[PDB]
Amino acid sequence: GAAHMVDITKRTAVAAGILRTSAQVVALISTGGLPKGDALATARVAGIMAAKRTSDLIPLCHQLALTGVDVDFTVGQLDIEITATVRSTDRTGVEMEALTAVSVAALTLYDMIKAVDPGALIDDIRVLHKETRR
Amino acid sequence: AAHMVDITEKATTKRTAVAAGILRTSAQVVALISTGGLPKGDALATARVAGIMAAKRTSDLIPLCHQLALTGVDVDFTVGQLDIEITATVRSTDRTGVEMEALTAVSVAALTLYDMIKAVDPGALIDDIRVLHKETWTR
Amino acid sequence: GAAHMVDITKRTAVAAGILRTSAQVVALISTGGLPKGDALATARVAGIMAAKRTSDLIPLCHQLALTGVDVDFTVGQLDIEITATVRSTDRTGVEMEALTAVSVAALTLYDMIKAVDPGALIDDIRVLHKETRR
Amino acid sequence: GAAHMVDITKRTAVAAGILRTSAQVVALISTGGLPKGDALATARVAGIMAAKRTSDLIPLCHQLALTGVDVDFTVGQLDIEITATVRSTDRTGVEMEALTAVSVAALTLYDMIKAVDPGALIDDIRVLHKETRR
Amino acid sequence: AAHMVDITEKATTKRTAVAAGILRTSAQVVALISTGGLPKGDALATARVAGIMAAKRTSDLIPLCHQLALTGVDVDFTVGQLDIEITATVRSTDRTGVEMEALTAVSVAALTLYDMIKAVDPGALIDDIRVLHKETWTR
Amino acid sequence: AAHMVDITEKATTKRTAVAAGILRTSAQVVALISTGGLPKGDALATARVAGIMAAKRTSDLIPLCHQLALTGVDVDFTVGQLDIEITATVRSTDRTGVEMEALTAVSVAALTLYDMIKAVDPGALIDDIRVLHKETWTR
């Protein structure tokens, strides 16, 4: 029981996901009251780098040259929605890169806050848009 | 604007952490898994291996994570009707807890599952990634 | 005494290599009786990933975007032949990627079985086909 | 407070930098009298590999397929000038790759000699040439 | 033609190393940093994170560097009139000094600063990367 | 479908492993090596450095390999008439044997040799990669 990858213009993919935590934690992330530092900046950077490493992590993904990567945060009362937008010019889509960016930003957020809220959840990681193209 | 926590004045103990997560997919996808009929191959074996390797790569991915000596890593699957539950168990003799590597393994295993199934069910989503247990802490 | 790399369509390279071990070990690999798990699946995945990492490992190799990578096994009585087929579209050949896939699959197989057969050998790693093109 | 990368023919970038050390150390590097081995060969290889890893290291850099990478050394009485020449065909310039090659060669040189000259300095890391193109 | 030094017959002690370096830039660049007006974003936060991660990747980059367990990593900036000083502090409980990781962090943080500012000041340069302190050794 | 072996209930000892391998090439290639006339440069130095670095990257490449603290790594060559023998010696103070890193080093050094010589002799092959010694185990 094994595996095999697939074979071979401008593309875009958007993924999102949610960190669910306490109102205290969300507020510390926003105002930067955490002892470990700025969670949003650290998570943004981690996710951006994780996008580029997708083929390192996910065995059957191809190495693709990404042309731009954005990590955005929408802060609510109890949660933070992470949106990752990835662009490329290659022979295949870039949703995997977007998803991994989302996942690693979320893991990083969690790392920054785990001493304050160890029960924090990472939820609803999904593709929002993909450009064969919907 | 970040400070790694200094673990220098902390003793090494034998630790274990367990994390879980869930891929929400289709009955068809579950079907193709049990039959071994996925286009890309054995999703479960591939994702187990990806989750194990990622556990080790934790400190490379997560900026403020310390480099920890892992003494063991398991990734288990429970396949339901529509869902695939993922459980990662990580063991280490070191200076801080290993819940990050457990979460990373679950996380990369889920991403890898999705890579294997996205052609049959691109609407699948990754849910409920969380710490179950640290050793006493239990959800 | 130093070094320097070379400068700059559709391409394919095939490499093979052989793990030589005991009849007991070959049989455990096939039927999956090993305590560490499925050797073939683990080795296939390791080799596929190693192909993508070739430029990480071999100092003077270029970073190439591979378009497909297959790892195949032919099981005999005493040995396992590993065949790696790599495809790409780039300015240079892909035999190094094929060879490293072969090598790392073989190292992985060995890792899976070393407690059962520590004298197991990795033999006859070679290029079978390269596409300037023979 | 966060970040975001930029979007998207033949290119070249040259960077240099200087290791400043003792006359004794410079001479050992040249004649290869160091216990840890050949410093120039080790540094050349480290820098060449570091060029390829630029996007791994520098968060907002893009993954670019480099087409050639040269690391050269000019040895003086008290110092060693490291010159890195990087070539590519991509949508953006390659000076970051050149700079990182310079930096990691210099760090490696320092690693090779730190037991002999711990006060050794890495100085004047800069872009010499970039090809929008000057 | 190289030999990694054998640290096998050496005891583990609690160690700290400090390294520094300097980015020579423009008053305009300093201005855009204090105002938060750089095109690419927060240079300081980005470079701090890059320096921390690189500290951990030291043995991957530098061929004869041993793999060391880092217990803590700080990257600090002092912004002057025209210059940005970088200081990395590394702590470890291990068999050899941690000055390489400190230098690597300073080094990658400087490269990352330059990446953030090169569009406003491509003539900027990276200067005076050096060991400040090892713990007794002091410059 | 894989389980990393748990080394948690195992003590740390001082260990050494030796592995070997052979590149089967041409008299011409041996000639160009002794004269320093290879197009790509110093094959031996390049491959030694590649073998050392790969030894450290073992647990990144081999899914079920544990992350081990290596205290020393040597790569030696014996150049014969037509062949180049490679020997890797790895030392570590840890919980499991270091034969994988020794084999990986030999392996990547051979691949790197081949990269340096494939333009003169593309028919060269890599042979007889094996464990020689673990410390008592001896082939």
Residue numbers in the entry:
A (entry chain A), C (entry chain A), D (entry chain A): 22 to 29, 35 to 157, 165 to 167
B (entry chain B), E (entry chain B), F (entry chain B): 23 to 157, 163 to 166
From the paper:
Rv0864 (MoaC2) from Mycobacterium tuberculosis is one of the enzymes in the molybdenum cofactor (Moco) biosynthesis pathway. Together with MoaA, MoaC is involved in the conversion of guanosine triphosphate (GTP) to precursor Z, the first step in Moco synthesis. The MoaC2 monomer has a common α+β protein fold that is composed of a four stranded anti-parallel β-sheet and three helices, α1, α 2 and α3 located underneath the β-sheet. The fold of MoaC belongs to the ferredoxin like family (βαββαβ) with one additional helix (βααββαβ) not typically present in a prototypical ferredoxin-like molecule.
The crystal structure of the Moco-biosynthesis protein MoaC2 (Rv0864) in its apo form from Mycobacterium tuberculosis has been determined to 2.2 Å. The asymmetric unit of Rv0864 (MoaC2) contains a dimer and three such dimers related by crystallographic symmetry associate to form a hexamer, which is the biological assembly. The two independent subunits in the structure superpose onto each other with a root mean square deviation (r.m.s.d) of 0.35 Å for 120 Cα atoms. Closer examination of the superposition reveals conformational differences in the additional helix α1, wherein the r.m.s.d between α1 region of subunit A and B is 0.46 Å. Upon dimerization, the 4-stranded anti parallel beta sheets of both monomers associate to form a contiguous 8 stranded sheet. The α3 helix is present at the dimer interface of MoaC2, α2 helix, loop region residues 83–89 (LIPLCHQ) and Leu122 and Ile148 are mainly involved in the dimerization of the protein molecule. Lys78 which is conserved in all MoaC proteins is located in the α2 helix of the adjacent dimer forms three strong hydrogen bonds through its NZ (Average distance 2.8 Å) to the main chain carbonyl group of residues Ser81, Pro85 and Cys87, with an average distance of ∼2.8 Å resulting in an approximately three fold symmetrical arrangement. The α1 helix 48–57, which is not typically present in the ferredoxin fold, shows a higher deviation when superposed with the other existing reported structures and it is not typically present in ferredoxin like fold. This helix lies adjacent to the ligand binding site and may impart functional role. In fact, one of the native crystals soaked in 10 mM GTP diffracted to 2.8 Å, but no GTP could be seen in the electron density map (Data not shown).
